[PDB]
Design an enzyme around this catalytic site. Structure first.
Site, PDB file in Angstrom:
ATOM      1  CG  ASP A  92      16.072  50.739  24.486  1.00  0.00           C
ATOM      2  OD1 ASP A  92      16.086  49.809  25.361  1.00  0.00           O
ATOM      3  OD2 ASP A  92      16.970  50.837  23.621  1.00  0.00           O
ATOM      4  CG  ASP A 268      13.816  50.068  17.486  1.00  0.00           C
ATOM      5  OD1 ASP A 268      14.057  48.991  18.078  1.00  0.00           O
ATOM      6  OD2 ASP A 268      14.633  51.014  17.378  1.00  0.00           O
ATOM      7  CB  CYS A 306       4.493  54.426  -2.742  1.00  0.00           C
ATOM      8  SG  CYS A 306       4.364  54.918  -1.005  1.00  0.00           S
ATOM      9  CB  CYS A 308       2.599  57.170   1.217  1.00  0.00           C
ATOM     10  SG  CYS A 308       3.759  58.320   0.406  1.00  0.00           S
ATOM     11  CB  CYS A 311       3.647  58.259  -3.742  1.00  0.00           C
ATOM     12  SG  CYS A 311       5.328  58.047  -3.125  1.00  0.00           S
ATOM     13  CG  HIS A 337       8.058  57.782   0.292  1.00  0.00           C
ATOM     14  ND1 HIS A 337       7.202  57.038  -0.496  1.00  0.00           N
ATOM     15  CD2 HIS A 337       9.266  57.194   0.203  1.00  0.00           C
ATOM     16  CE1 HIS A 337       7.877  56.039  -1.037  1.00  0.00           C
ATOM     17  NE2 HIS A 337       9.134  56.121  -0.636  1.00  0.00           N
TER      18      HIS A 337
END
Ligand code: GGB
Ligand code: GGB
Ligand code: ZN
Ligand code: ZN
EC number: 2.4.2.29
Lengths: 371, 371
Positions: A92, A268, A306, A308, A311, A337
């Protein structure tokens, strides 16, 4: 590898899916960018950020110019080398944080006091572009003037007009830096508050200058989802169709889905990282507050579908304990997560658009997430 | 796999190197145990702890009985499952923390107020052993009464004598629990302050009861290295030679080297984790304070010979920035490096003893570390 090549592979209504090819990697769209303000995505190593599926991260001109400093980062080999992330970074321009965290404004730019120590600094289109050059970012944002909400039509118009003059100055400063022009991309930022005529004037000015991508700026600043969606309804179609559309600082999962339905390609937000540290985990059945007593003996993972690593390995009960105890590992696991959840959401969005079933996905997603 | 089998592969003077085989893995000795008080080694996933070389970690009966609770951990499947560490865990008995962090003491045990909320709890030899059974730890510590420093000979004697009665009660409680007796090991704790005759009486009482290993308790409590080494000089030879010798809560790298020279096989300390979070990194040329301005543009890793993943990937300058900015990743990287440094130290100790060159190693280590 190309400097910047955007391809749209498939559409459904106003939604698009595709890729942005850049020298440091491919960005799959619609994309979610984890926020790495101070040269770190909080509580994650870069390899972990990548393992969640992220293709690109966001850095902040305002924070990095103050600490550790832009010329220092350049002397240390650039932001990618400094933090150990070798894929694309979008920065940014500083124009929003200078107003939200610091100030004297003029046509030349903004002078302001640092929030860290009250030291005095300057930003301008030319200095913002130079800082982003020193950082080495891959996607550079034009320097804009942010319009508070609500704003009168006349104040929104004068602010948008200044932003458009600053967009031209940003374009010229970027194009004067051969290294930047050859290796990076430059995005312009549409302004105009909630007013259709000003959004049109802003889109026309940006397209006349010409950018690699176009952000819808000035939203998610207190107007609420209904108004944000109303403005997106008319604003996104004004931007060039053949370039990426970036909604800055958005958002909750349902904000993302609705914005994709309105033609946004990139996002974002600090929500997954910040709220992870504060004990909120995203699930397909809506957010949960892991500190709540109901999770103290729950052996299920944060979300039972999930993919990930968190998890696969740890229970709600364990993460509940960690967060309640103030343990750093709690923040690490919750953040991994949540970022993984966001990336899995983006993947489902991309696949559903590619497969011509995004409308059904969005309905199914909402019905469950808000049940 | 064996419940508990200690082998000494090589000696040099009083130093030994070898292995403890247990059902959940092999522990290479001399060993350093990272401290995982509240069911986490602070700021590290278990896989990262293992990647540094650690074979075993320490948990704390006192902290875990208060939060999340011992019966809760057992209901959730035991400490290993709860925190995701599948290798050996040693648990301290609670007897030191109950005195340092909380109290009413008697021959039966100690009643105390929690430091978290002032709730009332009890510890005793029998309850400490039961809590450690519920946690599922692999090495169980006998419950002892800690002797302040300095202490009169008579107060040290009465405290040591009570500790020895509690050691017998700990032995009997452990042996009454078939699951524990079959799958875990029990260590006794020598007391006696700085007094040779009391240390001898304590060692004799412990050997008469019989333990799988013997800790030297009551040191590193304010007496300083010279006095600690003096006491170790006569105390370690009193313990059975054929069982591991554990120095609890030690220490700095030079404390470890000197204690190994005096026959210690096992160590735990919070120094690498705690001081990592606070900005102190261990190096072969001594500790450094990474926040110091001299590191702001230093592109070298924390230590230029360290094998750890942090030193392969990030600079002092970056970690300096992270710690100064309060970033969680700073704590993560400093902690991983420090634990890895400790494990590399233990590896060099083990190899040098095996190879009959430990005396030279210790001299070379000191000369550089204190230069
Ligand atoms: N405007 C800049 N430079 N940054 O964007 C800030 C996020 C805000 N939602 C916005 O869209 O403005
Ligand atoms: N004594 C127990 N239970 N724990 O040990 C505490 C560490 C201390 N250095 C000691 O050796 O006593
Ligand atoms: Zn997950
Ligand atoms: Zn290292």
């Amino acid at each position: 590898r190309p400097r910047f090549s955007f391809s749209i592979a498939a559409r459904e209504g106003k939604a698009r899916t595709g890729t942005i090819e850049m020298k440091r990697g491919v960005i799959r769209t619609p994309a979610f960018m984890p926020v790495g303000t101070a040269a770190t995505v909080k509580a994650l190593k870069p390899e972990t950020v990548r393992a969640t599926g992220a293709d690109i991260i966001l850095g902040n001109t305002y924070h990095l110019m103050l600490r550790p400093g832009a010329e220092r980062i350049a002397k240390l080999g650039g932001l990618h080398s400094f933090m150990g992330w070798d894929r694309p970074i979008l920065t940014d321009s500083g124009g929003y944080q200078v107003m939200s965290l610091s100030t004297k404004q003029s046509e030349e730019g903004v002078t302001f006091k640092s929030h860290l120590d009250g030291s005095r600094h300057m930003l301008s289109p030319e200095r913002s572009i130079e800082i982003q050059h020193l950082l080495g970012s891959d996607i550079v944002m034009a320097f804009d003037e942010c319009t508070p909400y609500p704003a009168t039509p006349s104040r929104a118009a004068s602010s948008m007009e200044r932003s458009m003059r600053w967009a031209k100055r940003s374009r010229d400063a970027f194009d004067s830096r051969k290294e930047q022009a050859e290796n990076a991309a430059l995005f312009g930022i549409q302004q105009g508050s909630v007013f259709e005529n000003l959004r049109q004037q802003s889109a026309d000015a940006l397209a006349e200058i010409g950018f690699d991508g176009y952000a819808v700026g000035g939203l998610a600043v207190g107007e609420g989802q209904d108004e944000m969606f109303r403005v997106l309804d008319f604003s996104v179609p004004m931007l060039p169709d053949d370039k990426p559309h970036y909604l800055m600082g958005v958002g909750k999962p349902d904000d993302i889905v609705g914005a994709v339905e309105r033609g946004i390609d990139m996002f974002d937000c600090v929500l997954p990282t910040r709220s992870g540290r504060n004990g909120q985990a995203f699930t397909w059945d809506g957010p949960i507050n892991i500190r709540n007593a109901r999770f103290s003996e729950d052996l299920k993972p944060l979300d039972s579908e999930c993919h990930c690593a968190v998890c696969q390995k740890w229970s709600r009960a364990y993460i509940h304990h960690l967060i309640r105890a103030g343990e750093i590992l709690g923040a690490m696991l919750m953040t991994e997560h949540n970022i993984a959840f966001y990336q899995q959401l983006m993947q489902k969005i991309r696949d559903s658009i590619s497969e011509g079933r995004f409308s059904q996905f969005a309905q199914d997603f909402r019905a469950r997430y808000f049940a």
